[PDB]
Amino acid sequence: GMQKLTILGATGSIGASTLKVIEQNPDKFSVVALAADSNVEKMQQLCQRWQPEYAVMANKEAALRLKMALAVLAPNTQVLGGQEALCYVATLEQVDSVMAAIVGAAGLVPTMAAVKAGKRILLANKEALVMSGQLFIDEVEKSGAQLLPVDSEHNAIFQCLPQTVQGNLGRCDLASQGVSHILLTGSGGPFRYTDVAELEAVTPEQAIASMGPKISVDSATMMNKGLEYIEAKWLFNASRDQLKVIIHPQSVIHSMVQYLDGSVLAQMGEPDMATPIALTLSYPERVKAGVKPLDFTQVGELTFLQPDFERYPCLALAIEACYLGQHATTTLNAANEVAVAAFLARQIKFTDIARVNDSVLNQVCKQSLDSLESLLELDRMARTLADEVVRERA
Amino acid sequence: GMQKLTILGATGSIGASTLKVIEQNPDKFSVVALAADSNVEKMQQLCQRWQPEYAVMANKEAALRLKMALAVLAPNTQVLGGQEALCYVATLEQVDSVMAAIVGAAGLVPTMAAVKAGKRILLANKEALVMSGQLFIDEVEKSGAQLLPVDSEHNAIFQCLPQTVQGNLGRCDLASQGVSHILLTGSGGPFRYTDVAELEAVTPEQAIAMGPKISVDSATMMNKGLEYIEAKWLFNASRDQLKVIIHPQSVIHSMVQYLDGSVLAQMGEPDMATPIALTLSYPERVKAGVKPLDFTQVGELTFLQPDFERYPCLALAIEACYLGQHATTTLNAANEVAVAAFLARQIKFTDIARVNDSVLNQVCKQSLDSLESLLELDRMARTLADEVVRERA
Ligand SMILES: NC(=[NH2+])NCCC[C@H](N)C(=O)O
Ligand SMILES: [Cl-]
């Protein structure tokens, strides 16, 4: 009856939220392995509290430091280091679910290893579907793995869909289950009400407005929503007709689904990742998450805007890239990482982010079976091109 | 494949919405019988268009006029009259579903007959659960009938609940399916922002701002009180599991709060074809002739907390709910009389609650129910309400 978990990415906020849910439900969930790619100090404190069978650092030098610490703080925890070790804890025979919350391309291989092992995948890595969506959906079908999305918007959509679609992510025909379209919602970022002409003079200070700066700039360009759009396409097998973006500045509603009869289902809640995580752990049942019920006294007004592509050119690029396929979305994601770093380094203007993305995307896709290796190679090629366009713009 | 329907109450707006959905889906639904009260002109036009096997008027004189009209225009339609005939078309062997949209206490007996026949019941009669909830839920269990609520709020709640609950209405333990509570929403009516002191002087013109009884009930929030009582019986909700929220714009139709912090809400254009369509198609979905919700034109959504100084009727309904069938039957009956008196300008708007309150107290100080015995109680309560209306006048 007990569900056994490996947590990939235990020292971040997703890891923390996952552990809070497990803390509320000690009779249902048990932590077999914890793994991290940063923060040995946090990791040793978590291994002390959780005493897991395995603890893994992605970096081998960091694993050595952890092993020395846990010789005192968690003597029965076996510490391991490296990429092979991440795959090892992700594929253990006794493990039922894997929280895949290591970010970036470093998360692909261990997430993929869990997929090939037929595990239940609590998906909190954007790159798996942005870079290699077709590949991931195929491997999931091949092994019988269950995919359950962690991210707020995707999780909300998941909850607003019928059970037949929930059980068969990536392979169901939406129109045959009565779905007209999915409404992906977003706040619109700090420049939601800013005149388009003023965007040229925007500074990194303004674009940050609390989480990491790359994620904040993506929120300002709505590239964050673009990437979510791409993931939604693969998660829910949605065509461009079936997938819409709506700006909802207050973020109380997390996303919605429009049905054929006129009915709309929406998911709402307090802004706490423990809620969506809790469902990924408990599906199809539900568990206490340590999150209070929504307080309609404090919600204030809910409003909606149509995104303007003059304001959010990156969003148009992501939608376009989406339906061109893996090569285009890998290219766009790579280019954007370079373009954002250049804006933050004050080499290019805020509005140049979209121009860099647009140039690189056009160059790559005018040319004519994919693997994780070949797509990483393409990621690298796109970065090189983006570096060159950054110089043109500087 | 084809679902066969009897429509009780075909000439009203619910009947019209049902027929619009059937019109969109001729490969899935077929009309076996249509039934109505005494709008013979609308009924003959519908029997012309639909050519059903049976057509029934509740009034026998009206049935005779219809029978003469249809003898050429709908030659294959057998016309019948009276209460027994309503029960007959509601219980036909070939019929799968019954739209129970005859309103008031007259709807109880034929709706109940459909229930005892084990039919799928598309419930659009408030009285079945307000007056005789215990009795209906028991009879539904006994026969294996499916109950699917037509009314907007209940239908919304139904859609926001898990599938395991949807398949067992009136008998599922909500907490065991992860539900903390149901959030029954309402507009708050035309006086949502009005000072309590000003309610004494409101006139029927102001209370109407859609039949007039339903509008006044919307102004007092008795509408929400009645819906509260029905929800309790439909979803088997305890006093912890059922809440009321004011949402003035009525875009959100109701919501459900789950154990993990997640809330599901149902929204849509204000068109009864949507909820009706789901009652017909469940667990699948069908085209309903309703456009998708346009979020560019929705405007702002807000929420308020009801005040019992502003909505005394809502407190009465909740109170009556947990006192049982006798109390809810009494309150409903009293309120029908009290609203008619307000509309006739015999009593003040704020006297509606006072009449309801007096009658409810009088009846429940005194001490196996049937439809007959509860109808008698309905009549006794009306008599008392008439007397309190004179005191107030
Ligand atoms: N977190 C990191 N940047 N790790 C890089 C180190 C790679 C690791 N030592 C290995 O050989 O598998
Ligand atoms: Cl967002």
Swiss-Prot record, chain B:
<keyword id="KW-0414">Isoprene biosynthesis</keyword>
<dbReference type="InterPro" id="IPR026877">
    <property type="entry name" value="DXPR_C"/>
</dbReference>
<dbReference type="InterPro" id="IPR013512">
    <property type="entry name" value="DXP_reductoisomerase_N"/>
</dbReference>
<dbReference type="Pfam" id="PF13288">
    <property type="entry name" value="DXPR_C"/>
</dbReference>
<dbReference type="InterPro" id="IPR036169">
    <property type="entry name" value="DXPR_C_sf"/>
</dbReference>
<feature type="binding site">
    <location>
        <position position="13"/>
    </location>
    <ligand>
        <name>NADPH</name>
    </ligand>
</feature>
<feature type="binding site">
    <location>
        <position position="187"/>
    </location>
    <ligand>
        <name>1-deoxy-D-xylulose 5-phosphate</name>
    </ligand>
</feature>
<feature type="binding site">
    <location>
        <position position="151"/>
    </location>
    <ligand>
        <name>Mn(2+)</name>
    </ligand>
</feature>
<feature type="binding site">
    <location>
        <position position="153"/>
    </location>
    <ligand>
        <name>Mn(2+)</name>
    </ligand>
</feature>
<dbReference type="InterPro" id="IPR036291">
    <property type="entry name" value="NAD(P)-bd_dom_sf"/>
</dbReference>
<feature type="binding site">
    <location>
        <position position="127"/>
    </location>
    <ligand>
        <name>NADPH</name>
    </ligand>
</feature>
<feature type="binding site">
    <location>
        <position position="12"/>
    </location>
    <ligand>
        <name>NADPH</name>
    </ligand>
</feature>
<dbReference type="GO" id="GO:0051484">
    <property type="term" value="P:isopentenyl diphosphate biosynthetic process, methylerythritol 4-phosphate pathway involved in terpenoid biosynthetic process"/>
</dbReference>
<feature type="binding site">
    <location>
        <position position="11"/>
    </location>
    <ligand>
        <name>NADPH</name>
    </ligand>
</feature>
<dbReference type="GO" id="GO:0030145">
    <property type="term" value="F:manganese ion binding"/>
</dbReference>
<feature type="binding site">
    <location>
        <position position="153"/>
    </location>
    <ligand>
        <name>1-deoxy-D-xylulose 5-phosphate</name>
    </ligand>
</feature>
<feature type="binding site">
    <location>
        <position position="126"/>
    </location>
    <ligand>
        <name>1-deoxy-D-xylulose 5-phosphate</name>
    </ligand>
</feature>
<keyword id="KW-0464">Manganese</keyword>
<dbReference type="Pfam" id="PF02670">
    <property type="entry name" value="DXP_reductoisom"/>
</dbReference>
<feature type="binding site">
    <location>
        <position position="211"/>
    </location>
    <ligand>
        <name>NADPH</name>
    </ligand>
</feature>
<dbReference type="GO" id="GO:0030604">
    <property type="term" value="F:1-deoxy-D-xylulose-5-phosphate reductoisomerase activity"/>
</dbReference>
<dbReference type="InterPro" id="IPR003821">
    <property type="entry name" value="DXP_reductoisomerase"/>
</dbReference>
<keyword id="KW-0560">Oxidoreductase</keyword>
<comment type="pathway">
    <text>Isoprenoid biosynthesis; isopentenyl diphosphate biosynthesis via DXP pathway; isopentenyl diphosphate from 1-deoxy-D-xylulose 5-phosphate: step 1/6.</text>
</comment>
<feature type="binding site">
    <location>
        <position position="14"/>
    </location>
    <ligand>
        <name>NADPH</name>
    </ligand>
</feature>
<comment type="function">
    <text>Catalyzes the NADPH-dependent rearrangement and reduction of 1-deoxy-D-xylulose-5-phosphate (DXP) to 2-C-methyl-D-erythritol 4-phosphate (MEP).</text>
</comment>
<feature type="binding site">
    <location>
        <position position="224"/>
    </location>
    <ligand>
        <name>1-deoxy-D-xylulose 5-phosphate</name>
    </ligand>
</feature>
<feature type="binding site">
    <location>
        <position position="223"/>
    </location>
    <ligand>
        <name>1-deoxy-D-xylulose 5-phosphate</name>
    </ligand>
</feature>
<dbReference type="GO" id="GO:0070402">
    <property type="term" value="F:NADPH binding"/>
</dbReference>
<protein>
    <recommendedName>
        <fullName>1-deoxy-D-xylulose 5-phosphate reductoisomerase</fullName>
        <ecNumber>1.1.1.267</ecNumber>
    </recommendedName>
</protein>
<feature type="binding site">
    <location>
        <position position="227"/>
    </location>
    <ligand>
        <name>1-deoxy-D-xylulose 5-phosphate</name>
    </ligand>
</feature>
<feature type="binding site">
    <location>
        <position position="152"/>
    </location>
    <ligand>
        <name>1-deoxy-D-xylulose 5-phosphate</name>
    </ligand>
</feature>
<comment type="similarity">
    <text>Belongs to the DXR family.</text>
</comment>
<feature type="binding site">
    <location>
        <position position="227"/>
    </location>
    <ligand>
        <name>Mn(2+)</name>
    </ligand>
</feature>
<feature type="binding site">
    <location>
        <position position="218"/>
    </location>
    <ligand>
        <name>1-deoxy-D-xylulose 5-phosphate</name>
    </ligand>
</feature>
<keyword id="KW-0479">Metal-binding</keyword>
<feature type="binding site">
    <location>
        <position position="125"/>
    </location>
    <ligand>
        <name>NADPH</name>
    </ligand>
</feature>
<dbReference type="InterPro" id="IPR013644">
    <property type="entry name" value="DXP_reductoisomerase_C"/>
</dbReference>
<feature type="binding site">
    <location>
        <position position="39"/>
    </location>
    <ligand>
        <name>NADPH</name>
    </ligand>
</feature>
<dbReference type="Pfam" id="PF08436">
    <property type="entry name" value="DXP_redisom_C"/>
</dbReference>
<keyword id="KW-0521">NADP</keyword>
